[PDB]
Amino acid sequence: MIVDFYFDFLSPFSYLANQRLSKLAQDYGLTIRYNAIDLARVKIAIGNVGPSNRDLKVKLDYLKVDLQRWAQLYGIPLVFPANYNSRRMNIGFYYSGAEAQAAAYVNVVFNAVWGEGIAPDLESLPALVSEKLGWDRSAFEHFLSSNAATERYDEQTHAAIERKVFGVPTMFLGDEMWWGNDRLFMLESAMGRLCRQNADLSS
Amino acid sequence: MIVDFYFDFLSPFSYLANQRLSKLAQDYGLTIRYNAIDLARVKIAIGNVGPSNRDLKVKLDYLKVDLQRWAQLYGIPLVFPANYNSRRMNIGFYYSGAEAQAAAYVNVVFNAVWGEGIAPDLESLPALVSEKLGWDRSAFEHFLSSNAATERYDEQTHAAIERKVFGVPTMFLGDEMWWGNDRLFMLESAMGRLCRQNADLSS
Ligand SMILES: N[C@@H](CCC(=O)N[C@@H](CS)C(=O)NCC(=O)O)C(=O)O
Ligand SMILES: N[C@@H](CCC(=O)N[C@@H](CS)C(=O)NCC(=O)O)C(=O)O
Ligand SMILES: O=C(O)C(=O)/C=C\c1ccccc1O
Ligand SMILES: O=C(O)C(=O)/C=C\c1ccccc1O
């Protein structure tokens, strides 16, 4: 069973969705196909050019509370980093190879940025993450600045826009798309339905 | 037990929240304090001046699907009206007297506009609603155009902005505020907690 997951490391609601998705991966062996994309580009593409929720103090004050409520439900910390400059770490995702290492990268980076509040553009973050994953620090840093890396990020962001993705976190199962950590319960219902039909419990 | 409910009849997510809230009122006797307010004014007040979700085709296409999914969960129809011109019906709410008649007005109008897809500025809607509620059609129509009616609507919208309301549907219980039909599960948790403490099941 395959779910396509679209996220940007600047997004705290993506941090929450990733935590929940990863527990489904580990608990039930669901296969996640990860896609790091540029939320700014995706918004611009659909004409969503007003002020961002981050720039609207009254609404942001409420979202911080919403985010703590979910973090408490999930039993994880949530700490805002100093900025939302996620480009480097987004691009870095494309260094990862197979599923296990792709998932490990996404988990380590999200935990660093939104679990601990580490700035996503911290100059030493690539080395810190490399040490964690058993990667070659210099190879990784060289990849992050390479033309090929940016091309790959641009390609995936474009493929997302073609798929009618307008925000993050976004999840697809078959032809159904859900946007929001707060729609994973619908994803889970769909997954249960397919598990039942495949077990011959339902037609 | 009192929940303050803030809505604008142009909002389909408010239609959904109202249906769910009303069933709590009827099933468990929860007291709802209704507040019809001007979403446009509340957005302008917090500086939320970009294009609205209604004007972003790609995102609207998804929201229509999200809205059908919830309508199916709740076992109710959801049909888009031809426009979002909710001012008259919003103001009309202030004709209602006590809780039962306030709730009946909000239910009838939401069912008309978002259950059946009736334009909220339909010239005959005030008469249709009056017939339903046993009101004096001419008295109601005269109220809708009165200076006092607009004053009362403006007063409530202003009180909402003071309370840090930035959108609809918004619900308060005590000092906690939740925004969205998709946060009523948190409201319900809070309500259960208070029912338990008041029953001496929890300290
Ligand atoms: N209700 C959501 C909200 C998710 C959300 O606000 N995502 C932002 C990025 S953190 C987004 O995609 N903004 C694009 C938009 O609002 O169209 C959830 O709980 O996850
Ligand atoms: N995720 C929500 C969304 C509610 C929503 O989008 N409300 C609109 C009006 S229908 C709103 O308050 N927009 C103001 C904003 O996005 O800040 C829910 O399921 O109810
Ligand atoms: O870049 C954006 O559009 C944005 O608001 C991302 C940040 C964000 C979103 C939602 C809640 C909190 C938050 O910092
Ligand atoms: O006035 C607005 O800001 C608005 O988008 C209200 C309409 C709406 C909101 C969300 C989903 C569908 C929809 O028509």
* CA A46/CA B169 separation, integer angstroms: 25
Task: Please count the other Cβ atoms lying within 10 Å of the Cβ belonging to residue B35.
Answer: 21
Long-range contacts of B183-191 (CB under 8 A, 24+ apart): B183/A66, B183/A182, B184/B17, B184/B20, B184/B21, B186/A69, B187/B3, B188/B24, B191/B1, B191/B3, B191/B24, B191/B30
* CA B53/CA B36 separation, integer angstroms: 20
Local structure of residue A178 (DSSP, 8 states) = E
* CA B21/CA B32 separation, integer angstroms: 8
Tell me if residue A171 falls in helix, strand or coil: strand
DSSP H or E segment with residue A175: none
Are the C-beta atoms of A49 and B50 separated by less than 8 Å?
yes
**Tokens 């209704």 appear where?**
B34
Tell me if residue A121 falls in helix, strand or coil: coil
Query: C-alpha angle with apex B26: B20 to B30, nearest 5 degrees?
Result: 80
Local structure of residue A112 (DSSP, 8 states) = I
Tell me if residue A34 falls in helix, strand or coil: strand
Q: Which atom of ligand 1 is nearest to the CA of B59?
A: 17
**Tokens 């307010």 appear where?**
B37
**B interface test, pick of A166, A179, A181, A185 with most B CB neighbours within 10 Å:** A166
Tokens of B67: 């809205």
Are the C-beta atoms of A75 and A115 separated by less than 8 Å?
no
Please give the distance, rounded to the nearest whole angstrom, from the Cα atom of residue A170 to the centre of ligand 1: 9
Task: Please count the other Cβ atoms lying within 10 Å of the Cβ belonging to residue B186.
Answer: 18
Phi–psi pair at A35, nearest 5 degrees: -140, 105
Local structure of residue A113 (DSSP, 8 states) = I
**Technique used to solve these coordinates:** X-ray
Please give the distance, rounded to the nearest whole angstrom, from the Cα atom of residue B52 to the centre of ligand 4: 7
Does A46 contact B69 at a Cβ distance shorter than 8 Å?
no
Phi–psi pair at B176, nearest 5 degrees: -95, 140
* CA A22/CA A12 separation, integer angstroms: 15
| CA–CA min distance B127, chain A (Å) | 38
* CA A65/CA B168 separation, integer angstroms: 17
**Tokens 């009618």 appear where?**
A164
Are the C-beta atoms of B182 and B67 separated by less than 8 Å?
no
Q: Does the beta carbon of A11 lie inside 6 Å of ligand 1? A: yes
Reduced 3-state DSSP string for A53-89: HHHCHHHHHHHHHHHHHHHHHHCCCCCCCCCCCCHHH
Tokens of B93: 């709410």
CA atoms within 13 A on the CB side of B16: 26
* CA A191/CA A177 separation, integer angstroms: 13
What count of residues does chain A have? 203
Task: Please count the other Cβ atoms lying within 10 Å of the Cβ belonging to residue A120.
Answer: 24
Task: Please count the other Cβ atoms lying within 10 Å of the Cβ belonging to residue A54.
Answer: 12
Residues of B in contact with A177 (CB under 8 A): 62, 65
* CA A48/CA B26 separation, integer angstroms: 40
Q: C-alpha B8: how far from its chain's center?
A: 5
Tell me if residue A173 falls in helix, strand or coil: strand
Q: Which CATH fold topology does A2-203 show?
A: Glutaredoxin (3.40.30)
Q: Which of A7, A15, A8 is nearest to A114 (CA)?
A: A15
* CA B162/CA B159 separation, integer angstroms: 5
Phi–psi pair at B199, nearest 5 degrees: -90, 0
* CA A187/CA A60 separation, integer angstroms: 27
Tokens of A63: 């979202």
B172 pairs with which residues across the strands?
B4, B177
* CA B170/CA A163 separation, integer angstroms: 32
Residues of A in contact with B181 (CB under 8 A): none
What secondary structure does DSSP assign to chain B, as a single string?
A: -EEEEEE-TT-HHHHHHHHHHHHHHHHH--EEEEEE--HHHHHHHHT--S--GGG-HHHHHHHHHHHHHHHHHHT------S----HHHHHHGGG--SHHHHHHHHHHHHIIIIIS---TT-TTHHHHHHHHHT--HHHHHHHHH-HHHHHHHHHHHHHHHHTT--SSSEEEETTEEEESGGGHHHHHHHHHHHHHHHTTS--
* CA B132/CA B142 separation, integer angstroms: 18
CB neighbour list of residue A63: distance below 8 Å, 6 or more residues apart: A53
C-alpha dihedral, A195 to A200 to A201 to A203, nearest 10°: 100
Cα–Cα distances (Å) from A123 to A7, A84, A120, A129, in that order, read 22, 14, 9, 11
